[PDB]
Design a protein around this nucleic acid. Structure first.
Ligand SMILES: Nc1ccn([C@@H]2O[C@H](COP(=O)(O)OP(=O)(O)OP(=O)(O)O)[C@@H](O)[C@H]2O)c(=O)n1
Ligand SMILES: [Mg+2]
Ligand SMILES: [Mg+2]
Ligand SMILES: [Zn+2]
Lengths: 49, 1362, 49
DNA sequence: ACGTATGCTATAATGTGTGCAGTCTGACGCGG
DNA sequence: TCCGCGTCAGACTCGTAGGATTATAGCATACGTG
């Protein structure tokens, strides 16, 4: 009865950069940060895989 | 071009005219279409010279046919454009203008010389009030300011007889009239009368300025500029862009502001305009001049086009972005290339991959050279094209020159000398550099996208220097610690570990082999595992008494893998070294052993072979990272669930109102801290020996071959601390503020964090990575600060001829010996014959280096304490001797004379701090402290030996200690210190002084999260100066009503009870005081701030009861972030805000007079008849209790020790022993290894200057503070000639100040305060003769150290020979 | 920083006194600043801009 | 003649302001 | 001489990236060189 509201999804804490990382839950926030920072630096390849 | 010194003096208006080749009279830069100088403009060729090499403007005289011809029409000479940056100009100022650097650069200088304040002078300048120059009629005296009202009064009344004027004109006439000869004598006379501190300081400084000003030959009028120099136009360029735009420096713009206003003043003086306007024009003119010299200083810096401030002159000499740091000491350099580095696992140590196309461009002049020799190129543009076409036969020539040619490889940042190492380039087709794995440690080079700069040593000397000094093979051990930095890691360690490590039976257990070759035969044949115990016949080679090697053949029970590793092992080391399972820590000893025994060659080979076999067998293993490998212990959910209910219990007790918030905060940390270590150990206990399932007959227990464990146990990557997060518990993270989150992370990385568990993990992660970026500048700035002071130190003499040394003892702190005496006193020259226990025969000579083998005999004899020849005990003037320093830890034997230590020392100190502020700041993110020091348990049996202890027995029957720095020793059978502890104040001892204890007995016990105030006498408690609301507060509960009292400090205290000291006074049953046994002190314990008290007024007490409990909140992981500042403060010599008092001279203590609790002390020494009084606070407690035999510098108060207080009293070897212990304590907390001699270097430099006390044969006199070396050279001639000795007293100097003290002003301005350094050096007229490195690196000469030491001294004999 | 009013206190301007000196500050979207601040003797002061 | 430079106009008008304001520890330097 | 508050000094080292302003009358003799 004390609960008034609830988080809608489980992804609202994070951003777009971080929502693309799978198993973020099993990753240190220091390496998670670098991982999302490098995912932005990913040059698209010849054939989109 | 080759000189001796550089001088700085004041630019006279007449002097400025000597450099100037003309007067710029117009702001006109160039004509708009004809891009050419204008008539006597700022780019005038009639003043600054011609545009091109030998070409006049109009074009009448061209090139060298008209060598030095001056044109008629334009009036321009025909010399090189060379002169356009050499030739200067000037401007004839209508009215004189004041220099901002001799007005605003404090001290005032112009005001310090006149004995006149700032306001007074400025209000004269901006025309607010007149100033008297000289009053004939003594009515008005000199330097007396008169407002616009007061000038008019004297004009009609007195007038004429008084001369007073306004603006920069007046102050110049004041400077021009003042007599330096007379006002020097006047000040000396006033000094003889009754001199104080401030009065004598002011007088002596002015006195020296006045004498300095006369001897510098400077005149105080040059402070005001009648002439203003112009910078050469090429040094303030107006050059055109490719895009048809132009671009000009901000100087040109600032110059046009000066000339316009100056010419407008000439115009207004032609018109005889009213003075009100002339005033504005003069104020403007000064604003422009001051803005030109130093823009942002006097007022708002004149902003320009892009709303930004104009860059002035001073700005190009000022700080980082100045010429010094940016365009002189640091340079972009030719024969230089950089590229992404990648691994070079095939290379040897003395090799590195260099791309072809890189080395191609780098060695361009060496190709053209070898080409003309072969006759393939006739000329150089022919050779240029041959290279460009990249034809086949040019690759083979490039390949020829590069062989037997070293290259320098640098990685940023350059922390220590090993940040550059030289190799023999190996051309590789690819844009990547390939670097040797073992030296990756020195650079800290991770192949994750690192780039390393290449540099080619051009000169043959540079090729020899690179091969001799900077070669990777010649650089093994760190200079900081005598320890190998060239040591495998990562794969290499793991591979050897896999090899050596053994297992049960396996294939072919207990077999029997001819050699370690049959072991390779059987393993690779598929009929034996590397983990099989088999008897093998190996023949080990042991060194004898001489150089000959003895051979011994025997049956060794090892493993197949160990046997194969013996093949790599050179013959000279024992086999017992590879008989163990090898790890990183074991491997580091193999190379060190190999080095100390065989030499250099054997080690380089060994090092490489170790690396090769390491990688190869690591890859044969197939070591992996499955998720079944991250094993969580069986009973994690069992530990936590009930460790949570543990914390939930106290939470309900707190809201009830007994356990306070601070006690709960420390109490909950202890529960989690136990649970965290509980889960950590259950993990490794289930993970280390997970292999409980073996064979042979039925079973056996064995080490686990879990991939992750092997990778941690071997010491390859990660540790027990990391695995905790993976399979165990992540642990408690740290906030970005510094406080630790009460709720830690329960989950690990296998099970997966929930949404918050990650949100929580962020707080500690961001703050840990914030201190990686921001905190690094303080540590790197320390390196800079240390270096400058330690630039000059170089090994000069071979033997200083001094007896003085430094007694060192073994660092035995925290039971287990922290640092052995052998390691402490290693490679340091003795100062005293140190023999064995039985004093009847010598064993170690006085002047002899301590090799590791000589130190081994110190262990047999068990040396007590040693006087080592230290750096600070050196008598060598301008440097040190090789004996004082001892061995070069990097090399491995006695240091070369000429090697520049100071820089090596500074680097060694700043590297660890700068490296421990980024390694566990990017990979960590959580606190790991365990400050639950509840109780000392003694481990070996001994007699209890306390020292510096004053205890008292309590009601319970327990020895309670009432002294702060109590130490506890552990004395063995014969009578020597084995273990040592710190017992704190109010601790309960199990057994008192002299009593026997057994092993594993709690000898001491106390509460860590509390600092009790314990009594020495029995009776009742009285409240004194404990008024509710002013000094203390009160808070009650319910039914009965137990109230606690909390003492407020000056922060939470009103202005009413500020001088009231709150204390719990002891009284008897009658109500009178109770004297403390054997002292005239009525019992009164002063409670400090935030002191929680449970007993209220009128409560009976025995001796040993706790009156109040002072909270001890300190749960912030010091790490390196909050430990470097303390290092800096020590070096910078900043006295603490609670220094401890010490006795000056030895004699009889005699307590004296008092002032409302403020205690004095009338000490009357036995020899010294004149008493000495010093004052003491009330709340502060002393250590001595009056009437005593005190010596020089006994401890009277407790707290932090002031570095100045130590040298002032207890001499040099006391302050050196302090800093060295204090500094190392901070680095030892972090596991940073530094030899004490490196700190001793900086200490020595901090003892550079010294104040003189007593008049000498030279005009020293009192108040002067000269360098210690110069005054001692005067004492050399004094003891020979007699005359009057110059007695002294050495002073301690902070780093920042010790750098600005050195006679070299170039070294000082190159550092910081550059605006001040130059002005002080100009007024003094000082000439720098260059001794330091910074000095000769600037001028680009030979460094008076290292390679250049042999050369510089060969020039010093040119000076000596006539 | 959002315009309006804001209450802060330098937890020890003068650690000499170690007194938590409380201060208030009116931050507009356009206009001059209006601050009120105490002192060691708890005298209210106003410092426009 | 060509380019640059100097010159004069006649209602009355007569004191400017503009713009970033969570830095911070440490160290002196003028009054009070 | 001591306290309070004003100014003034620092804050690691190398690599890469790209752009844009407003306006000053209007006309008639005076000054400098082919
Ligand atoms: N802002 C930075 C980033 C990096 N470095 C340099 O780059 C090195 C490596 O940084 P990084 O690869 O991020 O750290 P590692 O310790 O290699 O950790 P990781 O496992 O995350 O790669 C640092 O030690 C340092 O020499 C630096 O000086 N300043
Ligand atoms: Mg890297
Ligand atoms: Mg890396
Ligand atoms: Zn010409």
């Amino acid at each position: 009865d004390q609960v008034d509201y609830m988080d809608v999804s489980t992804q609202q804490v994070v951003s777009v950069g971080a929502s693309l990382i799978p198993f973020l839950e099993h990753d240190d926030a220091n390496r998670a940060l670098m991982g999302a920072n490098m995912q932005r630096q990913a040059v698209p390849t010849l054939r989109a895989d | 071009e080759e000189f001796d010194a550089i001088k700085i003096a004041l630019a006279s208006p007449d002097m400025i005219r000597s450099w100037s080749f003309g007067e710029v009279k117009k702001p006109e830069t160039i004509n708009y279409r004809t891009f050419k100088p204008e008539r006597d403009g700022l780019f005038c060729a009639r003043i600054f010279g011609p545009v091109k090499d030998y070409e006049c403007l109009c074009g009448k005289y061209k090139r060298l046919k008209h060598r030095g011809v001056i044109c008629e029409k334009c009036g321009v000479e025909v010399t090189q454009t060379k002169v356009r940056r050499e030739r200067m100009g000037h401007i004839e100022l209508a009215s004189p203008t004041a220099h901002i650097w001799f007005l605003k650069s404090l001290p005032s200088r112009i005001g310090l010389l006149l004995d006149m304040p700032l306001r007074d002078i400025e209000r004269v300048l901006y025309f607010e009030s007149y100033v008297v120059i000289e009053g004939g009629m003594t009515n008005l005296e000199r330097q007396q300011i008169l407002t616009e009202e007061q000038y008019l009064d004297a004009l009609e009344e007195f007038g004429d007889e008084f001369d007073a004027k306004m603006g920069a004109e007046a102050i110049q006439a004041l400077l021009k009239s003042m007599d330096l000869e007379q006002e020097c004598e006047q000040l000396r006379e006033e000094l003889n009368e009754t001199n104080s501190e401030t009065k004598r300081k002011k007088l002596t400084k002015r006195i020296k300025l006045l004498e300095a000003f006369v001897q510098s030959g400077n005149k105080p009028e040059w402070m005001i500029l009648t002439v203003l120099p112009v910078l050469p136009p090429d040094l303030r360029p107006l050059v055109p862009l490719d895009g048809g735009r132009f671009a000009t420096s901000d100087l040109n713009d600032l110059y046009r502001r000066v000339i316009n206003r100056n010419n407008r003043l000439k115009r207004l003086l032609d018109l005889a305009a009213p003075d009100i306007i002339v005033r504005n024009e003069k104020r403007m003119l000064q604003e422009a001049v001051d803005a030109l010299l130093d823009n942002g200083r006097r007022g708002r810096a004149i902003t320009g086009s892009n709303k930004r401030p104009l860059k002035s002159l001073a700005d190009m000499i000022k700080g980082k972005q100045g010429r010094f740091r940016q365009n002189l000491l640091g340079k972009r350099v030719d024969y230089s290339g950089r590229s992404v580095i990648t691994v070079g696992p095939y290379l040897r140590l003395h090799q590195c991959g260099l791309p072809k196309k890189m080395a191609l461009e780098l060695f361009k002049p060496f190709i053209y050279g070898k080409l003309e020799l072969r006759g393939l190129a006739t000329t150089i543009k022919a050779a240029k094209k041959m290279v460009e076409r990249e034809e086949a036969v040019v690759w083979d020539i490039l390949d020829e020159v590069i062989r037997e040619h070293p290259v320098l490889l640098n990685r940023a940042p350059t922390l220590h000398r090993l940040g550059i190492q030289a190799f023999e380039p190996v051309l590789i087709e690819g844009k990547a550099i390939q670097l040797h794995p073992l030296v990756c440690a020195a650079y800290n080079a991770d192949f994750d996208g690192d780039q390393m700069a290449v540099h080619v040593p051009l000169t043959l000397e540079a090729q020899l220097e690179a091969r001799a000094l900077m070669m990777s093979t010649n650089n093994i051990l760190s200079p900081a610690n005598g320890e190998p930095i060239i040591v495998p890691s990562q794969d290499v360690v793991l591979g050897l570990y896999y090899m050596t490590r053994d297992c049960v039976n396996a294939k072919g257990e207990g077999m029997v082999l001819t050699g370690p070759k049959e072991a390779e035969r059987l393993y690779r044949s598929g009929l034996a595992s590397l983990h099989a115990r088999v008897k093998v016949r190996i023949t080990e080679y042991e060194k004898d008494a001489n150089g000959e090697l003895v051979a011994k053949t025997s049956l060794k029970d090892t493993t197949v893998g160990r046997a194969i590793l013996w093949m790599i092992v050179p013959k000279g080391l024992p086999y017992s070294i590879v008989n163990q399972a090898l790890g990183k820590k074991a491997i580091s000893k193999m190379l060190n052993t190999c080095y100390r025994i065989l030499g250099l060659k054997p080690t380089v080979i060994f090092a490489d072979q170790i690396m090769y076999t390491g990688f190869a067998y690591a890859a044969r293993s197939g070591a992996s990272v499955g998720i079944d490998d991250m094993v969580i212990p069986e009973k994690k959910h069992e530990i936590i669930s009930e460790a949570e209910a543990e914390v939930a219990e106290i939470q309900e007790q707190f809201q009830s109102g007994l356990v306070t918030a601070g006690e709960r905060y420390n109490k909950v940390i202890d529960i989690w801290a136990a649970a965290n270590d509980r889960v950590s150990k259950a993990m490794m206990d289930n993970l280390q020996t997970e292999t409980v399932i073996n064979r042979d007959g039925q079973e056996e227990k064995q080490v686990s071959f879990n991939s992750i464990y092997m990778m941690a146990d071997s010491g390859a990557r990660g540790s027990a601390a990391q695995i905790r997060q993976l399979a165990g518990m992540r642990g408690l993270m740290a906030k970005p503020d510094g406080s630790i989150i009460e709720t830690p992370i329960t989950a690990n990385f296998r099970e997966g964090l929930n949404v918050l568990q990650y949100f929580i993990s962020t707080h500690g992660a961001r703050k840990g990575l914030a201190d990686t970026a921001l905190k690094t500048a303080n540590s790197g700035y320390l390196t800079r600060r240390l270096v400058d002071v330690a630039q000059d130190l170089v090994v000069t003499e071979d033997d200083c001829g001094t007896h003085e040394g430094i007694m060192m003892t073994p660092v035995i702190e925290g039971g287990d010996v922290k640092e052995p005496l052998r390691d402490r006193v290693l490679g340091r020259v003795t100062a005293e014959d140190v023999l064995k226990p039985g004093t009847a025969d010598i064993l170690v000579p006085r002047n002899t280096l301590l090799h590791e083998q000589w130190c081994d005999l110190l262990e047999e004899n068990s040396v007590d304490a040693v006087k080592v020849r230290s750096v600070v005990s050196c008598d060598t003037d301008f440097g040190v001797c090789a004996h004082c320093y001892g061995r070069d830890l990097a090399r491995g034997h006695i240091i070369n004379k000429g090697e520049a230590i100071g820089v090596i020392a500074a680097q060694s100190i700043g590297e660890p701090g700068t490296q421990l502020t980024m390694r566990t700041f990017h990979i960590g993110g959580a606190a790991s402290r365990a400050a639950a020091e509840s109780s000392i348990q003694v481990k070996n049996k001994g007699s209890i030996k306390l020292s510096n202890v004053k205890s008292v027995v309590n009601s319970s029957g327990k020895l309670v200690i009432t002294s702060r720095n109590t130490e506890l020793k552990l004395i063995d059978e014969f009578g020597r210190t084995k273990e040592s502890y710190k017992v704190p104040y109010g601790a309960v001892l199990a057994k008192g002084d002299g009593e026997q204890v057994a092993g594993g007995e709690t000898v001491a016990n106390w509460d860590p999260h509390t600092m009790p105030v314990i009594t020495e006498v029995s009776g009742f408690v009285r409240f004194t100066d404990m008024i509710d609301g002013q000094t203390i507060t009160r808070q009650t509960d319910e039914l009965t009503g137990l109230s606690s009292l909390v003492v407020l400090d000056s922060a939470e205290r009103t202005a009413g009870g500020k001088d009231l000291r709150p204390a719990l006074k002891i009284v008897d049953a009658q109500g009178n005081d109770v004297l403390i046994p054997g002292t005239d002190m009525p019992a009164q314990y002063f409670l400090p701030g935030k002191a929680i008290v449970q007993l209220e007024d009128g409560v009976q007490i025995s001796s040993g009861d706790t009156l109040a409990r002072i909270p001890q909140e300190s749960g912030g992981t010091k790490d390196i972030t909050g430990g470097l500042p303390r290092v800096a403060d020590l070096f910078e010599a900043r006295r603490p805000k609670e220094p401890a008092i010490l006795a000056e001279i030895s004699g009889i203590v005699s307590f004296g007079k008092e002032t409302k609790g403020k205690r004095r002390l009338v000490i009357t020494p036995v020899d010294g008849s004149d008493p000495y009084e010093e004052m003491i606070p009330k709340w502060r407690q002393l250590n001595v209790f009056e009437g005593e035999r005190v010596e020089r510098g006994d401890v009277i108060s407790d707290g932090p020790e002031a570095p100045h207080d130590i040298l002032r009293l207890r001499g040099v070897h006391a302050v050196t022993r302090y800093i060295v212990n204090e500094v190392q304590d901070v680095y030892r907390l972090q596991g940073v290894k530094i030899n004490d001699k490196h700190i001793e270097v900086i200490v020595r430099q901090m003892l550079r200057k010294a104040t003189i006390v007593n008049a000498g044969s030279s005009d020293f006199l009192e108040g002067e503070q000269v360098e210690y070396s110069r005054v001692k050279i005067a004492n050399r001639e004094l003891e020979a000639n007699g005359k009057v000795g110059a007695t002294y007293s050495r002073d301690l100097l902070g780093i920042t100040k010790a750098s600005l003290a050195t006679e070299s002003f170039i070294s000082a301005a190159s550092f910081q305060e550059t605006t001040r350094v130059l002005t002080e050096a100009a007024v003094a007229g000082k000439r720098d003769e260059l001794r330091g490195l910074k000095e000769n690196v600037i001028v680009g000469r030979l460094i008076p150290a290292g390679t250049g030491y042999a050369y510089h001294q060969d020039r010093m004999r040119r000076r000596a020979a006539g | 920083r959002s315009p309006g009013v804001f209450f802060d206190s330098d937890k020890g301007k003068t650690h000499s006194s170690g007194k938590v000196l409380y201060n208030a500050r009116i931050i507009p979207y356009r206009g001059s600043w209006l601050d009120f601040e105490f002192d060691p003797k708890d005298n209210l002061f106003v410092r426009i801009d």
